[PDB]
Amino acid sequence: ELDYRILGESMQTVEIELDPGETVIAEAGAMNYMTGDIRFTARMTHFTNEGQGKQHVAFAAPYPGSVVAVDLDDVGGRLFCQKDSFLCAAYGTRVGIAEGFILQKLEGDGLVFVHAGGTLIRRQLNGETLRVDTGCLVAFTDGIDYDVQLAGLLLTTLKGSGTVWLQSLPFSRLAGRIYDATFRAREEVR
Amino acid sequence: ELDYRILGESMQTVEIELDPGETVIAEAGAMNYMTGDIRFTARMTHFTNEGQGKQHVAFAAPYPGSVVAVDLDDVGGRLFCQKDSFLCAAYGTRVGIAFTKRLGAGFFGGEGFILQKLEGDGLVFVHAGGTLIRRQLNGETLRVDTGCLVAFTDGIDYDVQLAGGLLLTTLKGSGTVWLQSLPFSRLAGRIYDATF
Amino acid sequence: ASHELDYRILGESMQTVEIELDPGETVIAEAGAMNYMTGDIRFTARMTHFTNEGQGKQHVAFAAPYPGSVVAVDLDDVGGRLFCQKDSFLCAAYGTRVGIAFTKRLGFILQKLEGDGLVFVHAGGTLIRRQLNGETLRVDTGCLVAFTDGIDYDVQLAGGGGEGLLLTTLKGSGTVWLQSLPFSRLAGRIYDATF
């Protein structure tokens, strides 16, 4: 279905090629630019080529990092992913769940696009168990038993054969640490 | 007039090499370091080499992304620049405002959306958050998420609309556009209202 | 003697250190830094110690909460001592002694790292390494990642938000590590533009 180009080295934007007829779906506010005949509509926000040219719409996440293109057919037409990490999808993708940490399921035959904050980390699992700061979980396949747990620092335990995609800098860690660091300036009142 | 080297790969800083008597202008919150005989004066801050040999001062924007040198000669002696995107310029650069406009109750409700005009015959350095997307127009229409506009040459018309909140900038006409994938306004905005 | 860690630095401009621990080896990092860990890694609180409690080579990964690169510094290459901005510190071999060299509130903490093992600092934006040979360098205070003995320093309000530029003056002989995008600049600029 969709053609695309992933621009940038460590920080990435995905330029979606939309031929006349084709739609692409994305979270509100991910879009960078539209060429000419692209038109958009709210309901998830859908971008469609309304004219007659090979056209472009670019998307990028609101924190620094890389975009991974995942052909759904390459992974049994299913991919689990953290709601923050979802960037965009070939129209006719089923979403839904599987503001606390949210895991989403995406399934279909098309292209899906996920963002990994900071470093992208890809690992193959073969019976091995991997433990993962929960926010650092980007996406994973089937064949992976996952289990979220707690200290008292929320940890996710993964086990099986299959693929996990991790990120070194989740948006939640970045935003929370930014807030923390602002303490003095905001203490200046009381 | 100015020698420089751009350091780093995806995240960048500009180290300006100053000969004796030479000057670079920058907002002073962008400076990272300066060698010994560099002096600075509030009017934009001016950094001058007050020594006898080569001196250095480096500058970086306060959000991740890359630096581009733009020779004003190469673009008619005028560039339009989002203010957050201005990094530094050679002394003699004429820096003015081409456009100021508040816009709603989000990020551009604060300071506002500000386009500067940079004119002259020297070197200008601008910064693009995330990756830089450079585009030549050739009588075409480009619609851009408003904060994503870094810089543009003459021959390009622009105006900002509230779309269907979605702030859109429509570009139409000639030359070169410089766009950024992760504008500070998007970075700061999403972070602001997420810690809320 | 500190444990002898192995490692690999993952990524290009935005990096993470994956530390490799042999049975019974330990690495020290602040809580919240770790990204993943293999099956036999265990951890306890005091800064938390991550230990290979099982068999063979095991791995824990760590990153800083802002974009930049990782620098491995072998303390032996620096006479057993590194000065380090607090936020720049990422992780260190067990046996590393962490002290406070400096604190100043001007309206900013330097730790001292000591031992014979590996330490890992983080540089926001780009790393700029510089060598001083009897010279003075003036830096934006947050841009200071680390330095060696031989270097004299102080933090002052620049003077000449609408106020508050901190300037660090460095002088002497040794290595200085600088970052182009300090967390404090990033946090402060975001705060100013939104809050």
Domains of chain C, by residue range, sit at 1-195
3-state class percentages of chain A: helix first, strand second, coil last, to nearest 5: 15, 55, 30
Residue C154 vs residues B183, C110, C131, C133: alpha-carbon distances, Å: 34, 11, 18, 18
Pair of tokens at residue B43: 């009017």
Helix axis angle for B184-194 and C183-194, nearest 10°, is 80
Alpha-carbon distance of C122 to C14, in angstroms, equals: 10
Query: CA dihedral defined by A24, A30, A36, A39, rounded to 10 degrees?
Result: 50
Q: Are C8 and C62 in contact (CB under 8 A)?
A: no
B184-194 and A171-181 helices, crossing angle to 10°: 80
CATH architecture observed for domain A1-190: 4-Layer Sandwich (3.60)
Tokens 């000639």 belong to B174
Residue C63 CA to residue A64 CA, distance in Å, equals 14
Are A182 and C187 in contact (CB < 8 Å)? Answer: yes
Regarding the domain with residue range C1-195, which homologous superfamily does it belong to in the CATH classification?
Mitochondrial biogenesis AIM24 (3.60.160.10)
Residues of A contacting chain C (CB within 8 angstroms): 9-11, 64-65, 118-121, 123, 128-133, 136, 153, 166-169, 173-174, 176-178, 181-182, 184-186
Alpha carbon of A14: minimum distance to chain B alpha carbons (Å) = 9
CB count in 10 Å sphere of residue C68: 30
Spatial distance between the Cα atoms of C100 and C77, rounded to a whole number of angstroms: 21
**Does the distance separating the beta carbons of B140 and A7 come in below 8 Å?**
no
Contact C186, C124 (CB under 8 A): yes
- Give A11's contacts in chain B (Cβ within 8 Å): 10, 64-65, 130-131, 181-182
Helix, strand, coil percent values for chain C (each to nearest 5) = 10, 55, 30
- CATH architecture assignment, domain B1-196: 4-Layer Sandwich (3.60)
Q: How far apart are the C-alpha atoms of A169 and C124, rounded to whole Å?
A: 13
Contact B170, B156 (CB under 8 A): no
List of chain C residues whose C-beta atoms are within 8 Å of the C-beta of residue B58: 128, 180
- Cross-chain CB nearest to A128 (options C39, C61, C184): C39
Angstrom distance (rounded) from CA B32 to CA B53 = 21
And the tokens for C157?
A: 């309000």
CA dist., res. C30 & res. B44, Å (int): 39
For the packed helices C183-194 and A171-181, what is the interaxial angle rounded to 10 degrees?
80
Q: What gap in Å lies between CA C62 and CA B108, rounded to an integer?
A: 35
Tally of residues, chain B: 196
Task: Please tell me the distance from the alpha carbon of residue A180 to that of residue C48, in angstroms, as a whole number.
Answer: 20
Cα distances from B20 to residues B28, B47, B71, C50, in angstroms, run 20, 11, 22, 53
Pair B179, B133: CB distance under 8 Å? yes
CB contact under 8 Å between B9 and A10, yes or no, is yes
> Which SS3 state, helix, strand or coil, does residue A140 take?
strand
Contact C89, C109 (CB under 8 A): no
The minimum CA-CA distance between C154 and chain B, rounded to whole Å, is: 14
**Separation of alpha carbons C156 and C4, rounded Å:** 39
